[PDB]
Ligand SMILES: Cc1cc2nc3c(=O)[nH]c(=O)nc-3n(C[C@H](O)[C@H](O)[C@H](O)COP(=O)(O)OP(=O)(O)OC[C@H]3O[C@@H](n4cnc5c(N)ncnc54)[C@H](O)[C@@H]3O)c2cc1C
């Protein structure tokens with residue numbers, strides 16, 4: 005029997021499949037497209053996603069297919085330096101195309117035994133007290149204990165669940181185009197720099213093969229929401245840059261809005277939502293793909309705990325309680341960024357003020373920590389500021405903390421030489437290392453790296469173990 | 478013969494008259510209203526204006542008619558603490574009604590020998606190579622060497638000069654009302670706090686005599702721009718608070734827009750502009766009256782230098798070069814503040830972000846230093862960061878720096894015990910005090926307190942003296 009069906013083989017579903025396969029969960033990914041999408045939206049990973057890959061041993065292969073960058077401008081394009089005091093051991097951006105990211109995640113989920121089934125489109129679902137049935141577009145049916153809708157921003161699973169998707173509608177539309185041009189690159193760059201003095205939703209990135217990635221504001225809103233024709237691209241280029249640069253031969257044309265919507269419930273019985281299926285927003289700051297990977301990273305071990313039969317009764321609901329607010333804040337900061345990109349005189353004045361403010365180090369650090377998600381703090385109810393946050397990588401006596409996390413289990417980092425997780429040993433590893441560069445006596449880490457407890461008393465630790473690791477065995 | 482005619486007896490003109498009378502300038506103020514306006518717009522003075530009064534010995538009488546406050550919320554109503562590290566010796570707000578401020582400034586200009594003429598409205602002007610003629614509404618004429626339009630935001634002088642007044646038109650209108658209500662004050666306060674959770678352009682301040690100062694957003698824009706009727710006040714109260722509180726018996730009704738305009742030239746021959754005559758903007762931050770007082774403080778000694786015949790040929794034009802950019806930045810930060818008061822979802826998201834940012838001390842200090850004008854730096858062409866800024870009050874061996882400035886002349890603060898201003902002694906005082914709490918060897922201060930030179934070489938000081946104090950005598 006299949007334990008979990010994943011609808012959608014994007015980065016969220018692929019990352020989710022990897023996290024489930026770490027614990028033996030029989031996992032089938034139903035991906036509707038017959039062949040992988042060759043068009044990249046995302047252009048890299050932010051610090052928290054980079055850490056997550058390192059916690060799972062995948063950073064080396066990601067670094068081998070990407071380039072590290074330490075540049076500014078990630079909050080509404082506000083030029084700045086990279087914050088020199090970012091509280092991460094992975095303080096950089098990893099430039100890597102989403103097609104490459106999906107490739108690496110596909111290969112890792114496969115080698116762990118996840119079953120990827122392409123050309124399989126979920127069309128219906130029927131759940132009861134024991135499992136979920138997925139109905140494919142060809143009439144075939146698949147049965148599992150749980151189904152997770154990782155099927156993108158226009159999620160079939162979300163619609164079939166009737167989950168409300170409230171937020172702000174699209175009011176600003178932008179065009180996307182991979183095209184060839186009739187001007188030299190230096191001519192394109194000169195015009196772009198002139199337009200970007202006021203209109204920052206205009207840009208051009210070469211693809212290296214003679215094609216150019218163009219971003220250009222749309223004119224009004226479209227009724228069809230369909231892909232723009234080449235003619236529409238030329239009209240918007242003329243309106244924004246005064247010329248269409250002789251664009252021709254598009255190999256990709258697209259239109260995206262700035263709508264911000266959030267699923268009201270991440271869980272409906274035995275069906276859950278993750279990634280763009282649970283939340284949509286503009287790509288300001290490059291947060292969507294990171295937000296989806298970290299949804300799967302939060303959900304994986306919890307869902308595996310359910311399949312394993314040791315999950316506490318509130319564990320699975322903690323996926324919603326923790327990730328729904330994180331997405332709500334992402335949506336809010338993209339609405340703020342979009343306003344800072346507005347041409348209206350009011351927002352322009354606020355933008356100039358933000359330019360003054362980001363010159364202060366604690367502002368620049370605060371904005372980047374927001375964009376890169378390294379400052380996310382779940383409300384776990386404890387007074388300690390570290391509890392609820394992810395623990396950064398730290399040097400041990402030999403090696404580093406993240407090298408001990410590749411199994412996806414719990415981890416008690418103990419410097420007292422006195423604590424014990426006896427009774428939860430199959431679920432929580434005991435890292436007794438007084439030489440660990442951490443200024444707490446001990447820290448209990450969930451399998452997602454988030455701190456669940458800090459202290460030095462054994463009896464205090466024993467009372468905090470059952471919430472995230474169930475009953476002692 | 479009259480040296481200077483001042484059109485308008487508001488705080489700008491009254492402050493200007495005081496600065497001119499310090500140097501014997503025969504000064505006539507032509508104020509159109511027969512009796513002083515008893516309605517206050519401003520509710521106090523910010524730090525730079527407070528310092529300016531202390532430099533002229535007027536702070537004691539201002540403090541005796543006002544109350545000192547150290548509270549937050551001066552930038553777009555963003556709640557915060559008063560910055561604990563504000564770089565002023567006068568780190569507070571002086572709560573004092575504008576009617577009281579105008580009263581104190583009227584009495585001080587009079588006791589210095591300025592001639593205030595009420596019921597005198599400037600209707601025309603005619604200038605030539607030798608002077609200016611003011612034509613009053615009753616056909617009488619007055620002749621002087623210079624005329625300064627300090628006649629408010631709808632300046633007659635500005636219009637007659639044909640000076641362009643570019644900027645942003647009014648797009649947001651707000652109502653003002655001194656009225657009585659039919660509800661207890663605690664009922665008014667409860668409703669106000671509920672509305673101010675989203676609409677921050679709504680407020681109520683008691684007047685102490687049973688009347689209440691109401692601020693309420695208007696509905697759209699008015700064609701007449703005339704004063705709102707009581708009916709219009711009730712409609713806007715219902716729309717914004719759901720009730721009109723039983724408002725009745727208005728003793729003041731007003732409407733103001735958010736237009737931001739700036740005179741293209743502060744000087745036209747022998748006619749200059751100052752205060753609201755040179756710039757209009759919303760009252761966000763309470764900056765207008767301070768901006769006007771500091772216009773007069775910049776212009777006074779320069780205009781007196783012209784009348785005295787020792788002004789360098791570029792001195793009078795430096796009034797525009799220094800004050801026009803200062804006003805432009807005030808206008809810009811009020812457009813930013815208005816956006817932060819917008820109800821639209823975009824600006825609301827940016828406001829929440831600003832609320833996060835102002836918790837950082839250097840942000841809170843930066844915004845308040847902007848509002849209170851203590852960080853204004855004129856571009857005097859020198860590399861030293863202090864040059865162009867006003868020097869804060871500092872302790873001397875005995876007393877403080879500002880006590881030596883009441884004559885409105887130049888001041889060389891010398892700690893080397895070696896420098897000399899011989900040749901400019903009638904215009905620049907020599908404060909030789911090695912015990913002065915200032916970490917420069919010496920600083921040359923203009924009569925407005927702004928630093929013109931810093932160093933220790935006598936020959937370097939002699940080359941900088943003529944620019945602001947003319948030829949040696
Ligand atoms: C222009 C642009 C630029 C962006 N730039 C960045 C960036 O720089 N950084 C960043 O982090 N993010 C960025 N994003 C966002 C990022 O691309 C998305 O958030 C990311 O793809 C989300 O992954 P996902 O797996 O949730 O969903 P998706 O990638 O949408 O994939 C879901 C999968 O479900 C499949 N599917 C759909 N329906 C069904 C069905 N019924 N049955 C089975 N399978 C189905 C789809 O074929 C697809 O493969 C950008 C987005 C855009 C539009």
Ligand SMILES: Cc1cc2nc3c(=O)[nH]c(=O)nc-3n(C[C@H](O)[C@H](O)[C@H](O)COP(=O)(O)OP(=O)(O)OC[C@H]3O[C@@H](n4cnc5c(N)ncnc54)[C@H](O)[C@@H]3O)c2cc1C
Pocket residue numbers: 484485486487488489490507508509510518519520521575597598599600627628629630632633634653733751752753754760762763764765766767768769
């Ligand atoms: C609601 C509101 C709240 C405000 N709150 C604050 C605040 O908290 N802090 C702050 O600093 N500022 C505030 N301001 C702004 C401040 O009130 C003005 O900037 C200030 O009055 C400017 O002074 P002024 O002397 O230039 O001009 P004004 O005060 O306008 O006075 C000019 C004078 O010229 C006279 N006059 C006009 N035409 C003629 C003519 N033809 N001949 C002769 N005389 C003439 C007028 O009668 C008047 O007395 C506020 C403004 C408003 C509307």
